[PDB]
Design an enzyme around this catalytic site. Sequence first.
Site, PDB file in Angstrom:
ATOM      1  N   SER A   1       2.336   2.215   8.489  1.00  0.00           N
ATOM      2  CA  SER A   1       2.226   1.243   7.406  1.00  0.00           C
ATOM      3  C   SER A   1       3.589   0.753   6.935  1.00  0.00           C
ATOM      4  O   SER A   1       4.514   1.545   6.727  1.00  0.00           O
ATOM      5  CB  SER A   1       1.465   1.883   6.241  1.00  0.00           C
TER       6      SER A   1
ATOM      7  N   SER B   1      -0.147  -3.332   8.105  1.00  0.00           N
ATOM      8  CA  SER B   1      -1.089  -3.117   7.014  1.00  0.00           C
ATOM      9  C   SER B   1      -2.157  -2.144   7.490  1.00  0.00           C
ATOM     10  O   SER B   1      -2.913  -2.457   8.416  1.00  0.00           O
ATOM     11  CB  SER B   1      -1.717  -4.433   6.557  1.00  0.00           C
TER      12      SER B   1
ATOM     13  N   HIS C   1       0.808  -1.200   0.000  1.00  0.00           N
ATOM     14  CA  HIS C   1       0.000   0.000   0.000  1.00  0.00           C
ATOM     15  C   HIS C   1       0.850   1.262   0.000  1.00  0.00           C
ATOM     16  O   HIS C   1       0.320   2.345  -0.266  1.00  0.00           O
ATOM     17  CB  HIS C   1      -0.929  -0.031   1.213  1.00  0.00           C
TER      18      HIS C   1
ATOM     19  N   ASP D   1      -0.650  -7.394   0.879  1.00  0.00           N
ATOM     20  CA  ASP D   1      -0.168  -6.042   1.187  1.00  0.00           C
ATOM     21  C   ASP D   1       1.331  -6.134   1.469  1.00  0.00           C
ATOM     22  O   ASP D   1       1.765  -6.156   2.622  1.00  0.00           O
ATOM     23  CB  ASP D   1      -0.903  -5.400   2.365  1.00  0.00           C
TER      24      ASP D   1
ATOM     25  N   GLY E   1       0.738   6.053   8.727  1.00  0.00           N
ATOM     26  CA  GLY E   1       2.161   6.250   8.561  1.00  0.00           C
ATOM     27  C   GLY E   1       2.994   5.129   9.146  1.00  0.00           C
ATOM     28  O   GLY E   1       4.153   4.952   8.741  1.00  0.00           O
TER      29      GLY E   1
END
Length: 195
Positions: A149, A165, A40, A67, A147
């Site tokens: 992520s 994720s 992502h 992801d 963030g």
Amino acid sequence: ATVQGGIEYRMPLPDGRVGLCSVGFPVTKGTIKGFATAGHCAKAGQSVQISGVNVGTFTASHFPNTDRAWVTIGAAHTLLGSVTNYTGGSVAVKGSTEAAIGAAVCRSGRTTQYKCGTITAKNVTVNYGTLGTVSGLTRANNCTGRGDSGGSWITAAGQAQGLTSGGNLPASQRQTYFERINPVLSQYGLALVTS
Ligand code: NA
Ligand code: NA
């Protein structure tokens, strides 16, 4: 520059905008240096900066449904086989034994830093609206924010678990998700850096 699990990286986007995400795990592919992160965060060809310096480019990205992604890092940079705890220490990476439901795990990323919790479910599907869904995610109750992520999930004993994720930054009862690390290493043919 130094690449370590959990630290911020920045992505130059069009019109002077900057995307933010967190390093997952430093890896090698043969002698190529790299790190795994969330799909992502970017598509292949996205340049990547760490500590204000160009460090590499996204090499592959698979989101949604999965992801996951990984970034090739230039040979001049240093890989640390560890996850920062944001307060001067680090968790050394030892392997990728996947932990069970109920296991203690910490995640590291640039928005909420180092946050700890326990695993509560596996093989969960998360809905991303018009994008579709991501399946196979592990759920935990750790704190997280946009963030984080792509950032590292690891047990205190150093077993890599996964990659955060979740939502991007615009440019048990909490429910937080990560992409399991072993399928990512296997798909891309990556070896964790250990220490
Ligand atoms: Na899907
Ligand atoms: Na090593």
